[PDB]
Amino acid sequence: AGDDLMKYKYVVHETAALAGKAATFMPKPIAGDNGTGMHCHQSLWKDGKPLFYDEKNYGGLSDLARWYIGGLIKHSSSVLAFTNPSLNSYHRLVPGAPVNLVYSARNRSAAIRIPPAAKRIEFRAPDPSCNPFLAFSAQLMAGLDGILNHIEPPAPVAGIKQVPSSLAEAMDALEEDHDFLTAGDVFTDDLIDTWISIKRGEIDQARLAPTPLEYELYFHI
Amino acid sequence: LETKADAEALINKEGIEYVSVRFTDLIGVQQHFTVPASEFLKDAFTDGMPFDGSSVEGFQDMKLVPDVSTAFIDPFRKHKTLDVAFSIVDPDEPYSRDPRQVAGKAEAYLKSTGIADTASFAPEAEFFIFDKVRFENSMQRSFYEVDSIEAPWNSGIDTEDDGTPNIAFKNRVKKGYFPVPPIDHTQDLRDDMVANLQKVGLILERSHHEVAGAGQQEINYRFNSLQHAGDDLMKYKYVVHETAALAGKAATFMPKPIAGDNGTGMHCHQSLWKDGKPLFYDEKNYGGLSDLARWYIGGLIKHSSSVLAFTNPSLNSYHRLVPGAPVNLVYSARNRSAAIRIPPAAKRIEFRAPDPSCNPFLAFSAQLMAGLDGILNHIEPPAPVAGIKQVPSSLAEAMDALEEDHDFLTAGDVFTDDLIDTWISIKRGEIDQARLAPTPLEYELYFHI
Amino acid sequence: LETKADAEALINKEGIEYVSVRFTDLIGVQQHFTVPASEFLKDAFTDGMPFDGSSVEGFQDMKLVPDVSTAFIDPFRKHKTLDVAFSIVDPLTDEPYSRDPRQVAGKAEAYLKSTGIADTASFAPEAEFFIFDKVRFENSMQRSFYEVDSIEAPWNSGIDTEDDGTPNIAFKNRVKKGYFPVPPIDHTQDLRDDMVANLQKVGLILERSHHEVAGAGQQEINYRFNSLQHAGDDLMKYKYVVHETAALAGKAATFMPKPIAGDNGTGMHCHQSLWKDGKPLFYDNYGGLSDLARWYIGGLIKHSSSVLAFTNPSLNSYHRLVPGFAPVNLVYSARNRSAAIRIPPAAKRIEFRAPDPSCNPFLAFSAQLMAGLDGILNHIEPPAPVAGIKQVPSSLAEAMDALEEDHDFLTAGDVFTDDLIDTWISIKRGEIDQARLAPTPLEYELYFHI
Amino acid sequence: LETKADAEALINKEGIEYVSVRFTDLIGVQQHFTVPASEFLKDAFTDGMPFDGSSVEGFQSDMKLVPDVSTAFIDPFRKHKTLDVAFSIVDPLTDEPYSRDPRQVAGKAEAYLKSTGIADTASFAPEAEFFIFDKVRFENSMQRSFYEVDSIEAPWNSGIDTEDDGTPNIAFKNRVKKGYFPVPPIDHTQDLRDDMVANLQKVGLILERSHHEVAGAGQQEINYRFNSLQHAGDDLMKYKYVVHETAALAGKAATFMPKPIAGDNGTGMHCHQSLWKDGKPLFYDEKNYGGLSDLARWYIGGLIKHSSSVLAFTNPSLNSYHRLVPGAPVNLVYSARNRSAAIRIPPAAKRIEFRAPDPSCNPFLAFSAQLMAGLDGILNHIEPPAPVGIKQVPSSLAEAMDALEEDHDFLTAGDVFTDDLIDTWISIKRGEIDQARLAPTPLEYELYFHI
Ligand SMILES: [Mg+2]
Ligand SMILES: [Mg+2]
Ligand SMILES: [Mg+2]
């Protein structure tokens, strides 16, 4: 699926370029209009058979599926370090766009929506400015830790867990909560430390850069 | 000037036609309306001047009370005009969100504690002189562009704005401090500002070109008591802006207009006085500082994050306050990275953190209240010179600390809860605007991905 | 000035070469013709000045009678000129012309004294206005547009160079934040002071001048109050000074209630108070108001839609009179900023915030007085101070519908003639018909792709 | 087409690569998303096509689309071979008709007509005029507000020196109100009009007439054969799509605005109307005024009585009341000769021509409202006024919405027009009036700037 998206990105970019145009997967190129999100539909299969479906539940979700959500919510800010790894990512995730870490079937403000072999979990939080291999893996490892620890997610709906307010906050969360990633040596301390280092480098660049907004706000003062 | 009759005498003598009833809003921008000179003399000293503050940013009827001591003749107006500063009161009681009133009540709380009677502040407000400034934030595009004839990026230009060929002698990066003309192109304009500042009452000391080659300047004048020091800086800003504006240029107090060169800081010199005697002096300590001076530092260090919420209140402030600028909260004498610096009566404390994009009344008061809190509670500062306390990393973090620590400001009702709650609410809104706006840097980093 | 001898004395003391015989039309525009100074002294006081009122909008040979006290030296005219306001009368009878708005204001003052309620109706308008650097508009078959511009405008923060070719030095205004920072943020300070000086020169006693909320060059100048008719004369002189000072400065000044969208419009708050034998009558009670002042408000609320037909007579007026955050609630208060009538002893007055300065001051001030008087005489209690709050009209036609239905409080004492009311409605309905024909740029945005 | 096998056979033969899943929103603009043809033959007939109408104007979780294959046609504009198919909106669980689906309302209107027994079919024939411009631009900002149209036929270009292509002016341009209907070269858009006519024939329309209309700035009209109410709505949506695309791919712009320009003729959409039962006409009766039966006469009375509420759907734009001006079917009366009448009467050809509507409306909602009003008159024997104190059209959109708000029981009959739809429609149109309430006009600058 990571190979497909990279192939998907390559075609979109090239087809636009050869047409004399430019295609981008920026989560928020312009202000005042809708951003660009990459909803992720995920599910677990075994012996060619689905696992998330169960007639005895809210959205028709097996305990294996509900725990997957619970792990996704508990490790939310850590997962978003890979699903929303850009400074620009947090101009789309503005509470003005999913920002409430809670799951529901009807509500749209939920980061996790639930639409037998079609029963799946939809993570609306991510955006396509991410590495698909890293983004899809982090979501899987988050769910598995929820299943292995029977993590019960909050009740399907003023005290909802929120997405980080910045790229800096997400990296602090990833730095203090990544044991669920290092399980089975899937993610290594080498990669994690490198990922944080690179992203904190991009934060430092933003720390040095004056913005046109600040000119509008503070120049006359 | 001091009396109603003193003002009336000056009006007849200089033929003053109008009076600019001006004051400072919460943000730090001077607001005014103009009335005939006879109308000023008739009402301002009696029932004062009424105004609707419904549109003034950071307030929401109110009454304006004159302070003739701050009066000066406007050197920019076509018609002869007298500029007078007013304090806001209830139509009587001192207004909660008037910054100048905070400075006044701060001077009173100082005396009430018996610690001192006078707190002398001396700002070092730097600034930039640009030949052109333009910016925009729309859906399709967002930009800012400055320009200067001194700028190093213009070294290879063919023709200047006036049609005359390039005759070079433009500044280099971080090398504008401080060669003589023709390298310095803004010496004569700086002198115009210096002259106008002397004309409007200020006692000046020094003026020069600053580090940044893109036309950064600095003018220094003599210190004064807290409230008057705030008045002097507002007068300093108004004259600097106007003089450049009438010269076809733009002057700004942005802490960081351009990237890759020095930002703009406003070093604040601090000193407490009593009975006409210095209180920071003691030849038996580290930096010749008294125990009181040492405790003043400690209180400023402990509440630093809450203090910098007023001294560095803009989003742009944290593009100057970057490690690699005084970002370390510790005091010394020789060190040049320390936030607090120590250079009998001349013995004073230099806080190098603040920038001139702040409200001077609030900025100077916040520093005093922090110091006095350190004096009253004997707060010992860390030793002079890896656990060195840093400045806040963002504007949001600064507002977080102000919310959790503001009791030292509300002492003696100097800072009101209504003001601090308003100040936070305003700044959070600016942060929310940044949360919405995409940046050119993000295009450079993320577009191709 | 009071008489012919006083006029001749001034003509000599100032060397006046010509006399501008001016008068206000029914709409609210000042009309005039210029005569030599000697010709003015020779005929104006004896047989008056005749003119052909066939081509004056809303009128159709009548006689003009001077009010020397309205005279003032023109500070704009190349040749030394004295401007004098005149009154229109029937030559063979000297009877006041039915459609003369200045006469309506004069007949309102006379009716006021007949009631015994008061002898003086003071009015003080807070007329705001915009100063633009460029104004252009057209209404053809192929196109229909308007385009305003200002050096202070927020939409020019990103331009490279200005009108004079000089680089952008910023300090331009932001939306709804032009009230009222000091220069250089205020680029129209020296021009406003030029206006203030001219207003003082022509005889107005000024109080205040400042930049307004709208960043695109909106200002406001306040001056001392006056009796109804004279306050109408002063406001006409006010608008002329503002128009000419801006024009000769190479700019355009407008009293349009809403020239631009997204930012604040232009209003004209009217401060009202009744006086008798030199004593204030509104002072007493809640808000420091008297029974006479409260009944004045009640009559102002009851005939509101009819009064607004004169105080807000533009199609442009109802783009400011919008519930979109504006005085649209017919209720009086002292603290509420939503009340169309506000209450801020000799200063205890009524502030009507609804009107805009695109109206006829003579007709506007009269309509407010006649409404108040009707409330006083009939003991009309206003709604309680502060869901069922009375609203301003949602259209110009609705205002004309109300005026066509409720106008008897105006015809009392023959202040407003039926001839004037019908003619006023006819002109306004004619303007409504013009809008009924015209497509708008908004409609292209909404309906073209369909 | 008729069945699933028909479409599948066509896709193979014509090599159809994609399928445009289309529907009409509440306002009247066709919405769509494109899927592979194979994907369309796998899910549409069984599970249907799911979508989220949260972003669609006037719809608000996910809803369900069910195809009406008889509406299918091959797109003559797409680079890739595409089959355009219209869909109906139902609940993804109950398969029940979505209330805010205009096409479904038209389908529910044909069902109520049968339940009465008066007829089994209502036939509608629109006379939709339109404008063709070479350039159209508009903007509504704080600093300025404008619109500008241009045409090579335009009378305001008679004195122009150089055309858009660089060639000199060779005249033969129209004069004001005199484009009906000179032969070329005076008619500059004959070949483009014929291209539109050809494409309309290609997509399955049975065309009757094509010509240049009154307004000299590129006004045209293309007539096609009548049809049943719902399918007549389908044909018009396809009609407007072909017109829009043919002009667009010709470097031009086509609009159905009732009054794009002032000073010249407006654009209208006359709606011919007739009721049929068992193949027999019902509006014909030899021994009456306009050959009208009691059914036809009562139908008119229903139209007249609920005229203002009907015009809330037939003339639902602010721009509509710049055409509906007493300068135009304003008088709600019917005549067999008088053109000033809002209703005109021109044996199986006897029909009712409503001249009020304009093509800026939703055809599904427009045709349905006229029938329900007409059906209301029949069920109550509502007699219209004497053929020739005359009822006028609303003077504004607000008056129409005010009238629809008080008089709409005839629409709610048989669950055709739900209360949710009517409330939403009113709420949407009052939002547009609010926009007009906020926007200054160029006319006001002419009238009030100098004051
Ligand atoms: Mg320096
Ligand atoms: Mg005002
Ligand atoms: Mg036609």
From TrEMBL, chain C:
UniProtKB keywords: ATP-binding, Cytoplasm, Ligase, Magnesium, Metal-binding, Nucleotide-binding, Phosphoprotein
Reaction(s) catalysed by this chain's protein: L-glutamate + NH4(+) + ATP = L-glutamine + ADP + phosphate + H(+)
Entry note: cofactor: Binds 2 Mg(2+) ions per subunit.
Localization in the cell: Cytoplasm
SUPFAM superfamilies: Glutamine synthetase, N-terminal domain, Glutamine synthetase/guanido kinase
Primary site of residence: cytoplasm
Names of required cofactors: Mg(2+)
Molecular function GO labels: ATP binding; glutamine synthetase activity; metal ion binding
Annotated binding of Mg(2+) 1, by residue: 126, 128, 212, 220, 269, 351
Binding site for Mg(2+): 128, 212, 220
Keyword set includes Nucleotide-binding: yes
Positions of the GS beta-grasp domain: 14-93
EC number: 6.3.1.2
Keyword Cell membrane tagged: no
All residue ranges annotated as the GS catalytic domain in the record: 101-450
GO annotation terms (biological process): glutamine biosynthetic process; nitrogen utilization
Record-listed ATP binding positions: 207, 223-225, 271-273, 337
Enzyme class: ligase
GO cellular component, one term: membrane
Pfam annotation, one family: Gln-synt_C
UniProt-annotated binding residues for L-glutamate: 264-265, 320, 337, 353
Recorded family membership: Belongs to the glutamine synthetase family.
Subunit structure: Oligomer of 12 subunits arranged in the form of two hexagons.
Record's protein name: Glutamine synthetase
Automatic annotation (TrEMBL), chain D:
Catalytic activity: L-glutamate + NH4(+) + ATP = L-glutamine + ADP + phosphate + H(+)
GO molecular function annotations of the record: ATP binding; glutamine synthetase activity; metal ion binding
The keyword Ligase appears for this protein: yes
Record keywords, A-Z: ATP-binding, Cytoplasm, Ligase, Magnesium, Metal-binding, Nucleotide-binding, Phosphoprotein
Residue ranges constituting the GS beta-grasp domain according to the UniProt record: 14-94
Binding site for Mg(2+): 129, 213, 221
Residues holding L-glutamate: 265-266, 323, 339, 355
SUPFAM superfamilies assigned to the protein according to its UniProt record, in alphabetical order: Glutamine synthetase, N-terminal domain, Glutamine synthetase/guanido kinase
Known partners and oligomeric status: Oligomer of 12 subunits arranged in the form of two hexagons.
The family this protein is said to belong to: Belongs to the glutamine synthetase family.
Protein name from the UniProt record: Glutamine synthetase
Organism: Bifidobacterium adolescentis (strain ATCC 15703 / DSM 20083 / NCTC 11814 / E194a)
Name of the encoding gene: glnA1
